[PDB]
Structure formats: structure tokens, C-alpha cells
Design a protein around this ligand. Structure first.
Ligand SMILES: [Ca+2]
Ligand SMILES: [Ca+2]
Length: 70
């Protein structure tokens, strides 16, 4: 079920449904959660979470990042 719930949530964040979560999509989520971090904080999270420096948070990075903070 973990892979399901995780896949589902991922599908929600993937507003563009491009298979990759964009920084903008992450920010919108933060607002929905009632949380707002500085641009430098979010930018750092994307960079820190991104293992391939692709600039985009991929499922592996998301789950991985999610596992970290959890
Ligand atoms: Ca997207
Ligand atoms: Ca990536």
C-alpha cells in the first residue's frame, strides 16, 4: 500500500502530470498544507532533494526526501 498511497499523492502533486514534480507544484502543496517557507528554503529543498541535479524532483527523490523528513 505504501507504493500506492505514495504513488497517489505523487499523482496529486504532479499537477502537470508530467511524471515529475516541479518546484511550483511543491510550493502550491506547501500552501495547501498551510506551510510557507522562504524561496531560499524551497529552492534548497529542490536542489537538496534532487539527486540528478535535473532541477526536477522525481518520484525516487520525493520518496527519498519524504523518507528523510517523514
Ligand atoms: Ca509536474
Ligand atoms: Ca530528479
Amino acid at each position: 500500500d505504501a507504493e500506492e498511497e505514495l504513488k497517489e499523492a505523487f499523482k496529486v502533486f504532479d499537477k502537470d502530470q508530467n511524471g515529475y514534480i516541479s518546484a511550483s507544484e511543491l510550493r502550491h502543496v506547501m500552501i495547501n498544507l498551510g506551510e510557507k517557507l522562504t524561496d531560499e528554503e524551497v529552492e534548497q529543498m529542490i536542489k537538496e532533494a534532487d539527486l540528478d541535479g535535473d532541477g526536477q524532483v522525481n518520484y525516487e527523490e520525493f520518496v527519498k526526501m519524504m523518507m528523510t523528513v517523514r
